[PDB]
Amino acid sequence: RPSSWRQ
Amino acid sequence: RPSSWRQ
Amino acid sequence: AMGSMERASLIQKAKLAEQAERYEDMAAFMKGAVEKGEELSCEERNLLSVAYKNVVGGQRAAWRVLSSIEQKSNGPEVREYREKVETELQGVCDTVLGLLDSHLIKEAGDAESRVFYLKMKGDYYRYLAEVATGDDKKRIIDSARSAYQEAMDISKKEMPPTNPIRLGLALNFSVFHYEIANSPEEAISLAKTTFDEAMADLHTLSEDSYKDSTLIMQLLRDNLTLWT
Amino acid sequence: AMGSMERASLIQKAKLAEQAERYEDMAAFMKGAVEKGEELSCEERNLLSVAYKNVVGGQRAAWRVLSSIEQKSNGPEVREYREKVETELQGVCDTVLGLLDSHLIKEAGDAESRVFYLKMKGDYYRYLAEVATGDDKKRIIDSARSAYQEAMDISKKEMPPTNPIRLGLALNFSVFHYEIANSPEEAISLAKTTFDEAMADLHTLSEDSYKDSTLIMQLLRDNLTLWT
Ligand SMILES: *Cc1ccc(-n2ccnc2)cc1
Ligand SMILES: *Cc1ccc(-n2ccnc2)cc1
Ligand SMILES: [Ca+2]
Ligand SMILES: [Ca+2]
Ligand SMILES: [Ca+2]
Ligand SMILES: [Ca+2]
Ligand SMILES: [Cl-]
Ligand SMILES: [Cl-]
C-alpha cells in the first residue's frame, strides 16, 4: 500500500 | 514505572 | 452531545485528547466545535483532520485484517464481524462528510480553507470507496474524484507548488488514481509532475517552509519508487 | 448486549478482534461469553484477560498523561477531562470486578482457574487504587491486597514455582507492594524469592515450558534491576 498524507 | 505481566 | 460545552473548551480538550492519544474523544470534541457554527482556524482545521484520520485509520486497518481473513475463508462470524467494523467505518465517514456539507465547505472562501475541506471530502469518499461493493460504488468513486478535482483546480490557481496542503492534496489524489480508479499511469504522472514543480519552487522558501514542503515531497518520492 | 449471540460465536469473534487489535470489541465479546454463565477454559480466560488489560491499559496511559498535565497546571478543562477518563477507567474496572464476583470466582475450583481470577481481582483493584484519592482508597488498597494474598496462598500450595500464572501473580503483587502499598522492601523480597525458587525448578521443565517460565522470570529481573 502506498503512502497518503500523514502528520 | 516497573513491569507488570504483559503477554 | 457537546452542545453545552464552550467552543474554546472543546478546542482545548481536543488538544489534550491528542496528547493522550484518545482520538475518538478528540474527534467528538472537534465535531462539537464545528457544530458551534463558526468557521475554523488553520490550527483548528488540522485538529479536526488529525482526529478523524486517526479514528478512521484504525477502522481501515481493522477492516483490512478482517477482509483478508474473510477472503482466505472463501460460519458467518468473520463476515458478520467484518460487516460490523465496515458499518462503523461508514458511519464515521458519513459524519465527517456531514460536517463538511453542513456547513464547512459552503462557508470556506479562502483558498487554504476551501482546498483543505475539499481534500477531506475526497479522502472520506475514498475511504467509503475502499469498502464499497454495491450499486453505489461508481457514484462514490466519482464523488471522491469530483471533490479532489475541484480542490486541485483551486490549488493550482491560488497556491504555490510547494504549499503543503497543495502537496498533500496531490499525494492523496494520486493514491486515489492508483488504488481506487485503477489508473496507475495517472497516479504516476500526477506524483512526478507535482514533485518536479515543487523542486523548482523550493528556492523561494525559508528553512522552516523548506522542511515542511520536502517532507511531503518525500512521500511522493516513496510512492513513485513503489510504483515504478 | 451480546445475549442473542452464541457462546462459540462470541469466542470466535473475540479472537478476530484480537487479530484486528480491536480490544474494546474483544472485551465486549468476552463479557458476553462470561455472561452465558458457563465456566471458562484456560484459553478463554486468557482472551478475557488480554481484552480488558489492553482496554484499561490505554485508559491508564491516557490518565497518566492528563494527570501529569494537571499537576504542572497546579481553566477547569484539564481536571474535567482527567475526571472523564478516570470515570471511564473506573467503569471498566467495575465491570471486570463484577464479572469475577458474578460469578467466575465462586465457580472456580481448580487452582489454575481460581488463582487466575483472584490475580485479576487484585489487578483491577490495583488499577482503581492508582486513581483513588478519597475516603475509600485504603479499602480499595486492602481489597487488592486481600485478593492477591489469597491467590498467593493457593499458588504456593497447588502450583510449582515455575508455573507462569504463579510467576505473573508474584510479579504483579510485587508491583502492588512497590507502587501502591509503599512497601519497596516487600516488593524486592517477593521478586527475588520468586525468581530464585523458579531458577531452582527449571530443570524439571520441557523446552517450551522453560521458555514460558524464563520469559516472566526476566520481568522479575528487570524490576529488581530498576529497584536496586
Ligand atoms: C492534507 C494535508 C494536511 C496538512 C498538511 N500540513 C499542514 C502543515 N504541514 C503540513 C499537509 C497536507
Ligand atoms: C497473569 C498471567 C497470565 C497469563 C500467563 N501465561 C499463561 C501462559 N503463559 C503465560 C502468565 C501470567
Ligand atoms: Ca460560547
Ligand atoms: Ca468564509
Ligand atoms: Ca447456545
Ligand atoms: Ca467449577
Ligand atoms: Cl459482529
Ligand atoms: Cl470532559
Exposure of D200 by Cβ count < 10 A (0-12 exposed, 13-18 middle, 19+ buried)?
Answer: exposed
Nearest 5°: the CA angle C95, C177, C165 is: 60
Report the phi/psi class of residue D134: left, alpha or beta, with left for phi > 0 and alpha for psi in -120 to 50.
beta
Q: Residue D181 and residue D187: Cα distance in Å, rounded?
A: 9
- Domain assignment of residue C2, yes or no: no
Pocket, ligand 1, Cβ cutoff 6 A? A 5; C 49, 119, 164-165, 168, 212
Number of domains making up chain D:
1
Residue of C178, C179, C216 with shortest CB distance to A5: C216
- Domain assignment of residue D2, yes or no: no
Q: Residue D38 and residue D28: Cα distance in Å, rounded?
A: 16
Q: Which triple of cell numbers denotes residue C88?
A: 462503523
C-beta atoms of D62 and C12 within 8 A = no
CB < 8 Å from A in window 171-210 of C: 171-172, 175, 178-179
Q: Residue C50 and residue C172: Cα distance in Å, rounded?
A: 15
Q: Which residue shows C-alpha cell 494537571?
A: D70
D171 lines ligand 2 (CB under 6 A): no
Q: Residue D56 and residue D24: Cα distance in Å, rounded?
A: 10
List subunits contacting chain A, requiring 3 or more Cβ pairs under 8 Å: C
Nearest 5°: the CA angle D10, D13, D17 is: 135
What does the radius of gyration of chain B's CA atoms come to, in whole angstroms?
6
Nearest residue to C24 (alpha-carbon basis) of D24, D137, D112: D24
Largest CA distance in chain D: 61
Q: After which residues is chain B broken (C to N over 2.5 A)?
A: none
Exposure of C177 by Cβ count < 10 A (0-12 exposed, 13-18 middle, 19+ buried)?
Answer: buried
Nearest residue to D165 (alpha-carbon basis) of D151, D180, D144: D151
Ligand 8 center to D83 CA (angstroms): 7
Task: Compute φ and ψ for D28, nearest 5 degrees.
Answer: -65, -40
- The approach used to solve this structure was X-ray
D168 lines ligand 2 (CB under 6 A): yes
Q: What is the 3-state secondary structure (H, E, C) of D152-215?
A: HHHHHHHCCCCCHHHHHHHHHHHHHHHHHCCCHHHHHHHHHHHHHHHHCCHHHCCHHHHHHHHH
C-beta atoms of C81 and D17 within 8 A = yes
- Domain assignment of residue D189, yes or no: yes
Q: Which triple of cell numbers denotes residue C205?
A: 522558501
Amino acid of residue C218 = Q
Is residue C170 a contact partner of residue C194, using CB atoms and an 8 Å limit? yes
Please tell me which residue of chain B has the smallest CA distance to D166: B5
Other Cβ atoms less than 10 A from the Cβ of C165: the count is 20
C-beta atoms of D226 and B5 within 8 A = no
Closest ligand to D3 CA?
5
Nearest residue to C88 (alpha-carbon basis) of C60, C120, C126: C60
Q: Give the structural domain span for C199.
A: 7-228
- Domain assignment of residue D66, yes or no: yes
How far separated are the first and last CA of chain C, in Å rounded?
A: 48
Q: Residue D176 and residue D180: Cα distance in Å, rounded?
A: 5
Is residue C147 a contact partner of residue C118, using CB atoms and an 8 Å limit? yes
C-beta atoms of D172 and B4 within 8 A = yes
Contacts 24+ apart (CB under 8 A), D104-111: D104/D34, D104/D39, D104/D40, D107/D39, D108/D39, D111/D154, D111/D155, D111/D157, D111/D158, D111/D159
Q: Residue D131 and residue C1: Cα distance in Å, rounded?
A: 26
Q: Residue C182 and residue C161: Cα distance in Å, rounded?
A: 26
Q: Residue C32 and residue C53: Cα distance in Å, rounded?
A: 17
Q: Residue C222 and residue D80: Cα distance in Å, rounded?
A: 43
C-beta atoms of C172 and A5 within 8 A = yes
Is residue D111 a contact partner of residue D159, using CB atoms and an 8 Å limit? yes
Closest ligand to C8 CA?
3
Is residue D82 a contact partner of residue D120, using CB atoms and an 8 Å limit? no
- CATH code of the domain in which D182 resides: 1.20.190.20
Question: Cα–Cα distances in Å, from D67 out to C12, C146, C228?
Answer: 15, 45, 49
D45 lines ligand 2 (CB under 6 A): no
Is residue C77 a contact partner of residue D6, using CB atoms and an 8 Å limit? no
Amino acid of residue C165 = I
Nearest residue to D129 (alpha-carbon basis) of D144, D147, D117: D144
From the CA of C108, how many Å to the nearest CA of chain A?
A: 22
Q: Residue C187 and residue C121: Cα distance in Å, rounded?
A: 19
Nearest residue to D226 (alpha-carbon basis) of C107, B1, C160, C32: B1
Q: Residue C68 and residue C79: Cα distance in Å, rounded?
A: 11
Please tell me which residue of chain C has the smallest CA distance to A2: C223
Is residue D169 a contact partner of residue D152, using CB atoms and an 8 Å limit? yes
- Domain assignment of residue D1, yes or no: no
- Domain assignment of residue C166, yes or no: yes
